[PDB]
């Protein structure tokens, strides 16, 4: 409807307040170190960020 109910439901917290910064997914996020990236997207881009495998 109008502006009073279109987005009136609070999303200041919870799982619905956070989304993947790459694919806009809402499951398996990684908020550690302010990453804000999906679980799969982090595996996709870890070489680019610099998280490399040692052991």
């Amino acid at each position: 409807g109008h502006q009073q109910l279109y987005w009136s439901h609070p999303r200041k917290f919870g799982q619905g307040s956070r989304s993947c910064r790459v694919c806009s997914n809402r499951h398996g996020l990684i908020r550690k170190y302010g990453l804000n990236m999906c679980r799969q997207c982090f595996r996709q881009y870890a070489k680019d960020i610099g998280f490399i495998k040692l052991d």
Binding site: I30, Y33, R39, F42, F51, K53, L54
Partner: protein, 104 residues
């Protein structure tokens, strides 16, 4: 001016950190500024353990990713001014430099 400055260098790789911490202090010796020795701070090991599969089906294998952050501190102390003397930085990509004074 009477100045005493601190230069901290941080990055992900020891080779470039060591060569910067070497060439900067060698320039200081050739430019006769007495050098407070390079202090190697403990390494920051950013660890992220994540399930390998994008599905949740399998043998529950976990992939662990590491990021090593190394940082060094060099205090440049001279009886005369320091900043007007040293102006070149000679910094390659990858390493981040921060210069403060004794007040900060």
């Amino acid at each position: 001016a009477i100045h005493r400055i601190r230069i901290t260098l941080t990055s992900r790789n020891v080779k470039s950190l060591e060569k910067v911490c070497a060439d900067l202090i060698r320039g200081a010796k050739e430019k006769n500024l007495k050098v407070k020795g390079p202090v190697r701070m403990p390494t920051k090991t950013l660890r992220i353990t994540t399930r390998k599969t994008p599905c949740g089906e399998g043998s529950k294998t976990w992939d662990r990713f590491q990021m090593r952050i190394h940082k060094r501190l060099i205090d440049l102390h001279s009886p005369s001014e320091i900043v007007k003397q040293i102006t070149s930085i000679s910094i390659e990509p990858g390493v981040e430099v921060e210069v403060t004074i004794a007040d900060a």
